[PDB]
């Protein structure tokens, strides 16, 4: 197999900045103690592609998570804050768009390459958090 469109995301990334993430978690419904501990985390993100399967791992002092998925195909995900959600991830003009649905709620996580950074935009009902990763 040759190059994949998600290949621009492949690599090991480290969180270098975060804005409004506490407010975002509040809007998602995250409880106090989880918000405080999760907000301290400086996770590493490891993204790989094998054929049609994309894997995104997050390693931190808070939790280690891993999702593997095929674009456009819904899957089960247990989030770092231990929500049990139904997730679909697609590629839209070079942006990975991740929708999570649970308990009649929805949130959208967009991951995009900007310069040498991986920028993560987390949106819930008007609240947006921007998390910036650099190569590790």
Ligand X SMILES: O=C(O)c1ccccc1Nc1ccccc1
Using the rule CB under 6 A, give the single segment among 5-13, 55-63, 67-75, 87-95 that binds ligand X.
55-63
The answer to whether the beta carbons of residues 87 and 106 sit under 8 Å apart is no
CB of 125 to ligand X, least distance (A): 15
The answer to whether the beta carbons of residues 77 and 63 sit under 8 Å apart is no
Nearest to 63 by CA among 42, 85, 91: 42
* Annotated binding residue 35: no
| Span 93-112, contacts to ligand X by CB under 6 A | 109
The answer to whether the beta carbons of residues 70 and 112 sit under 8 Å apart is no
Instruction: Order the strands of the 53-59 sheet from edge to edge.
Output: 64-70, 53-59, 44-50, 11-19, 127-135, 117-124, 105-114, 95-102, 84-92, 75-78
One residue of 12, 44, 55, 60 binding ligand X per CB under 6 A: 60
* Annotated binding residue 132: yes
Q: Does 80 bind ligand X (CB under 6 A)?
A: yes
86: its two tokens: 């139904």
Nearer residue to ligand X within complex by CB, 41 or 91: 41
* Annotated binding residue 135: no
Binding footprint of ligand X, residue count (CB under 6 A): 13
Q: Does 43 bind ligand X (CB under 6 A)?
A: yes
> Can you give the binding site for ligand X, defined by CB under 6 A?
15, 38, 41, 43, 58, 60, 62-63, 80, 109, 120, 122, 131
């Amino acid at each position: 197999r040759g190059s994949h469109m998600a290949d621009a995301f492949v690599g090991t990334w480290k969180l270098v900045s975060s804005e409004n993430f506490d407010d975002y978690m509040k809007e998602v419904g995250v409880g106090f103690a989880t918000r405080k501990v999760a907000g301290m985390a400086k996770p590493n993100m490891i993204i790989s592609v094998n054929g049609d399967v994309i894997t995104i791992k997050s390693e931190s002092t808070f939790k280690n998570t891993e999702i593997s998925f095929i674009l456009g195909q819904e899957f089960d995900e247990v989030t770092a804050d231990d929500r049990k959600v139904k997730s679909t991830i697609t590629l839209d003009g070079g942006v990975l768009v991740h929708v999570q649905k649970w308990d009649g709620k929805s949130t959208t996580i967009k991951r995009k390459r900007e310069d040498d950074k991986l920028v993560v935009e987390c949106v819930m009902k008007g609240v947006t958090s921007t998390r910036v990763y650099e190569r590790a």
